[model samples]
Target: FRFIGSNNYYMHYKSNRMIDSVLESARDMGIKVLRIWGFLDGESYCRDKNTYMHPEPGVFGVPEGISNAQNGFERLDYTIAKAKELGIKLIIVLVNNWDDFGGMNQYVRWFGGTHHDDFYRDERIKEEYKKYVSFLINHVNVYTGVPYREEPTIMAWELANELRCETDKSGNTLVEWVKEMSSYIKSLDPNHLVAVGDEGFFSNYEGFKPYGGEAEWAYNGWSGVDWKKLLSIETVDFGTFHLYPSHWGVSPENYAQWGAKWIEDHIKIAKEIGKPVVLEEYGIPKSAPVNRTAIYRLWNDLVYDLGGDGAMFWMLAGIGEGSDRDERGYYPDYDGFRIVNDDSPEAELIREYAKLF
Candidate 1:
């Protein structure tokens, strides 16, 4: 056990300051693992030219063209090194479902396609994605001189961050994409595990009992994801699920009970499928009426009681605080899932949970 923690987005830093400062905070909190964004893409996604991983249209399909300081891959390399130094493992996501950092849409945009889900269906895009996948896994971290496939610092590779295919409500396209990409990762690296990084929604009532709310769509397969089938993929080693009841439209009174069953449902299916599951990304914003800390405690208890593999909260950020503070553009509460201090109740609770695990 001894694993459970938060997801911090700025782990792939161009500056050692952010990398060191953030992870040093994680070390202090007894954080054993983190879910970090391993992929940053396109000119439009980054603060400067120095941070794009693919170098966009010019080098989009070229595998050899990757691995550059100017492209920010080396900065990611430094993160791998720093995380290992602190004995922390990363669940690194390769792509994103959203357009925030030129995600799956970026691939579609590169090829003149307009539809978002086309990236999953397009053969050309699929090939380029594999090229990036193979190149990334086989890449040697310059700081440690260790190829990523051989790096113990990475606990697993998350196929994408909350991937959803809207056009295909059947969940087939995304399913195939996940199998293909996850199988591809397996072919390249046997040392690491693979997770789809989906928000655990079901196709039917097979996996969970209803905690009736306006959130019925989440259980009805509207999001183009089938939780049971996703975990049933033979190559997939584990399961992942996220929660955002406030955003997902649960009534204020139902937040805790609704989410408690949500965790129970995912755990039930994961157990049936014989795979370990994580409530990998979950948080209720401070704007809600619920006690965020109490909810975290309850959710953590559910994971423990139901035999879920792990639980990682939305974020753990202390990058800009005290003498090490650098708040230039840091929006710690950007999403209202704030847990910013080392001594804060959120961090301390996670510390207690970490020891029990």
Candidate 2:
């Protein structure tokens, strides 16, 4: 599978040109799998300001819990149709743990507070979230004229993106929530697989040791999740992990070795539980393009050699002309990870690895 970060607006906005560009680029690179945003909270700006997808709860005129046309569902519907047309499979993430979009913050605010953990335990918030989930799963694509639950374009339904719960000191609350939500999703749409969308982490306990003794430093470790425990849930279909040595303060010189160890450790755990794992998201800064390519290649080769299921890069900005700051040009690595044209070395490498899928 080829993974790239994409949002709903990119597919719905601009008369479907942006979505077309993305598909064309993916087709050129022989990419088939896409990791797209199934939830864009209250108000978000992909390129320009004031753009949004999901409206806050209790907003007048729009549906109470579900998204409306102005809020972003129509665009989401179109994206599903277009992706199916282009032969791309999608991993649709329902909610973001972070506040980039409304996310947990919006849910918290709906109850008149600012705590993210409340989202998991609060009855009102959970009910509303279920409503939103029900709406999305039951939605019928306007273009395809087929219900979303029946659409094979969607590969999986992720519970949340990088979920964390500071309020749950014991970590049981998050686990229970995953079990409930995943079961609920499975109940609604058994045809699709469900994932927790968590950054794989380990607890400081027996049989849950951190890889390379870097538990205190890894992103997921700090997030307070027992990743192995979560993936072991019967309803959760697979395991997912991310790699960002730079963000974790690992030295660039030793990133390849460190990343290899990180991936191998996660793969070992996944194998233990009889589940497949994906390197769902990973990337390095473009400041060292050569280094980025080397690490990317290394991770890809490791994943394939070790029997890992899939690997998706952090993002792929679509092709054609646009400002670097705009949606089409938004590359956080300062163009380091951005694969704009099929002729670039990075593109060649991506195409080479894509064949393995």
Candidate 3:
């Protein structure tokens, strides 16, 4: 019965006022679960600042160690404490697959600019990552006096966001990476659920090739990891996938149909694996077809009825009026996807559906 809640790109830079605003907004909208970014690569945009979370070990004169007093960790501590106070649970994504926040790319550069694909293969990089994961799992919340593993306010720990690796077209390396990392997390914190924050990509299953032609780059092996195999990992707790028909180059005429099938297929696989799946991210761009609200309702209902855990809208920006065209602002899906008030039909519709949950 969980309606989607989002504050993308909000956790990296921390502010008490901003944290208060996010919680207040969620309470007003009946949002109980918030998915937040937890990873920032060494080359992150704000790497030069004292707040940067995962600075290069030796580069930039930042020590290769972990500490709760660090700015990024301190901000996260505040966020978790506030979320607990507001009765809102958090799904913390541990890393990013893209270069936006210096993800694997930053790791590669940390070791002399090797190929991004080496992130999983290189022993040195993998060891460094293990240290990072250990620090996060063992960290005790400064405010709650409880280890992060025991925090009930934390819903789950996600591996990465929209992970895709062009280097390994066969999707083997990615599978092993998920298995290893998820197992490591379980060893450290067997109390919470673990999910590979991947856009469900199927390969060599039922002879279906969804990413043909221009759509080839859509899934692109997601760092050489197959969705089916990745979810099948023993340590993996649940399944996740996203929907972006327009971005997938899906024809407008077939958009609705394809979307329905997408949900159905993922649900089927999740059932086979005996894990609940979530439509983690989905949205219809404003410039696209005019039935955005209707489309949202359709997917919402499908996920609800199909026995999926829940669905999260692409984003939930705060109340405001200015255009989000500037690159420095929110991710530029500003046309119509951004919701500012409860008066819009979209907002009310979410509230209505949430009641059913």
Candidate 4:
């Protein structure tokens, strides 16, 4: 299914039942891809005191304060079991800014709370990071029969959610990381794909603002790095991009054009690199001119006209929560972004787009 929905709140410590409820809701909506946040240890690994990479030194980490990465697979086992029950494919995000030192927020605070440094320079952290990936591969490998999908359910193993560094150390570091980690995952379950999650675009590399600087600003100097140059690593199965037009400052009238431009540019890059493109994140308001309908069409045109894999809208709401005020209005905001209502025009448009897949 192209219209992958997400449970971003999984980054927080939610009970397995809560996870099942969320998965069931998405299944009811006819969504097949369910993206979750924070697979390693959750917030517990993010605390300033936790120096070692894994949450429990040896174990991966925990959610909030719970030591689950050692057993986090149990939670995931449950999540996957529920996903299998609902006929959903789980797109699991293995790390977070709070837990993994490589996440955007943690990268922002590499040296301290303010200064930034190349994440790969810290050899110990880097080694531990690979071990953490190993933990995931070993547990979730298709051969091990994880998520217990009789059909082999996982969609992809995201290397890191929004993995961007502030400094221009060299794309080689990221290349090496992707190669090693992706190789490890493929060694375990060669069926799944691997993606490098980045909130920035090719324009971000050029120092131009994307999404109007609304919510969170991705690391600058992306314009300088050669994403094309890095694609030579060959381990990345495909590429994913994040687009936040309102958040970046693009006007409502320009959202569609900007989104189209973003996709066009990436498609050009993908053509050169020979990997399919997935717009992993993009959002516009329900009331805006582009709205969800126009936004989805813009992406649909990309897939239709340019041959992209598909797009995954920003997210789905927390269970029983009526709105996502924090995300919708967080910055260069669009307060009506959620598509939970069946009667809503945006929902119908989304359902229509799903038919294309």
Candidate 5:
């Protein structure tokens, strides 16, 4: 029931010592669900199976051997064990925004140029994408294997990590891709739940698709997607959305209002679809001058009042540095936006506000 946690990459690239400490602390903190990124900055733990390729050069990337090694799987195995030990559930992300080390980058926007063509037109790539998907669903272990039966960890398997289009291609549709990939994951692992890592981009549901029907913005309100159409896919277990005031152009003064609206809209749409809604990501930046505590309270109130299921803060640790000249900390400061501070007044507000549900 707790949706507070961060995105940690230690599962694939770093040492286990840090994970032990983190899991222990999270458990002590009453954290229920932790979202661990499947891919690091440029590495897909599932696809490339080896090297983390950085498209921008000089940016961070993981080597293939270490990322895909047996040790990598072992790392997850142990981490999940630790989560169970600490009474924590894990929302496992299966892919990353950048880097397709496995040669199976299904979402082509991260690759750029002709690489985009490779994802849309190529049948082989699609098949490999599904195959890798099957591999991941079947192989990755948290607490119990195969049947979830009384499993202490592994709340759900997130489809991808913040999926997006490459150059806004027309032929490839996000909804169709979501349907295909979602179906594939459910087919392979029926016990665990599944969600698209869209972060509310398609909540409006206005884009075109390969078969038919426009892509949904992925949530409710003006961005409301047609639930009847989206849920028609056999694999969709539930729905998830991300919220960020600054990312969506909401000013600091109106962050709480925007956050409340987003939660309200998503809940309305989810009710229409007859599925639970999870705020997969949400958090105010440390630099924001407005009281984040009040913003979180308003947002949480809406989520609970609307019957939403869970909400995971954007991240656990800061990953990388900002690429654009815009002063916003989009990259390296990801960790700076975490909501779990015991020493700050905002932290107290978060803790108190979270109890509203």
Candidate 6:
């Protein structure tokens, strides 16, 4: 239920198993909502290219490259329809500020801009993003005939996946972009909610640096995110944040406490903003020396007890070896932040946490 959920990248791919595998894993834990990428940028739509929703300017879903895969949106169409059928709601992110899947930087390059933050300030890049937003908002699901703007299964439209404009240390430019894009999305699809998908980093908090005094980027506003301001945006229905202590130099000694504090900070701000906030992404890597389940239980209990809107961990993946395999069953724990089986201890804790809701 509201207590727990997970995110995925499979929804936009051409394979149903990739999509179904993850969703079914969520369903196994009785998770009500899942977040997935709604936008992927690049020119090549190769057979193995899993991320490419918008290949070129003014072009979408068209196939290219040697390996064949027709309109990519067709797979997305099946995704939404499948989620609906499974009674699972989705939080669909529109773009990415990071470079993982041809994100904000890609748009900037297309528009002849060089700065990473240009995606927020550049007029041309903004227009290109708007074009994609408009097209996606208006896109009718080929499998269901209902347009995305009108799709009930879409619980929210996230502005981007962890949007961070590294060039703006003041965090004003990214806030401006969120206001514009969220307002634009609100006008297009009034039916669903819109959330600021930043990593919930605060700009003005001195005592709140989880990474300590050394790394100011996350809490010192260098990441181009002002969490409170973002949630306060009139058109933004909710807030989102992510936590990865392992990668952020968080000492294993205080990992769980730091995570709890991180969640509490956002929840308190969300309460003040009068907008619900979700612990949209948080994870303890499997490779860490810490007990993953114990950490999860602490965070899960804290979120539920404090009445945080929801909590979705970093990822939930379900891909088997051999027969259940897609391309020899390649389910890489490359990031060390994944829950691969429903019956695993992590997922069992997920089920336990969901019961509290």
Question: Top model by lDDT, which number?
Answer: 1
What lDDT does the true structure give each of the candidates? 0.81, 0.72, 0.74, 0.57, 0.56, 0.79
The alpha-carbon lDDT assigned to residue 85 of candidate 4 equals 73
Off by over 4 Å in 3: 1-3, 48-50, 58-70, 207-223, 319-336
- Write out the backbone clash pairs for model 6: none
Better of 2 and 4 by lDDT: 2
Higher-ranked by lDDT: 2 or 5:
2
Model 2: lowest-lDDT 10 consecutive positions: 43-52
As a whole number from 0 to 100, the lDDT of residue 106 in candidate 1 is 85
Error (Å) of candidate 5 at residue 289 is: 2.3
> Mind giving the per-residue lDDT tens digits that candidate 3 earns over 1-357?
455655445654546765666676676777777788876667455454446667765332234573332456667788889889998888898877788767877887887756877888888888878887778777787878988889989999998888776678688788888889999999999899999989898765664545323344443454365888888899988888988888888876666767777888888889888988988888777667557778888888898888888887766655322343344343244445665434777778777776665
> What are the models' TM-scores?
0.92, 0.87, 0.87, 0.74, 0.73, 0.92
Put down candidate 5 lDDT per residue, 1-357, tens digits, no spaces. 535444454455444555665565556554567787553323343333342323222323333344343344456667777777778788777665445333224344344425643563455556645654554455535444633323447788776665555444331355677787787776776678787765654333443221111122333223323433454456777777777766665667777766776677667667877887788788788778887767766776677667888766665532223241124332244345753334566556545554443
**How good is model 3 by TM-score?**
0.87
Please give the ranking of all candidate structures by lDDT, highest first, separated by commas: 1, 6, 3, 2, 4, 5
Query: Which wins on TM-score, candidate 1 or candidate 5?
Result: 1
The 10-residue segment with the lowest total lDDT in model 1: 60-69
lDDT: worst 10-residue window of model 3: 319-328
- Give candidate 6's whole-model lDDT: 0.79
* Residue 102 CA displacement from its true place in model 1, Å: 0.7
lDDT of 1 by residue, 1-357 (tens): 536878988666446776787677778777789898877766667534346666464353224644453445677788889999998888999988898777889889988898988889898988878887787898899999999999999999999899888688898887888889899999999999999999998876654555865688888888889878889999898999998888888887888888998998888888988999988989988788878888889999999888888999998775554343446544357778867545667777888888876
Candidate 2 differs from the real structure by a C-alpha RMSD in angstroms, to one decimal, of 3.7
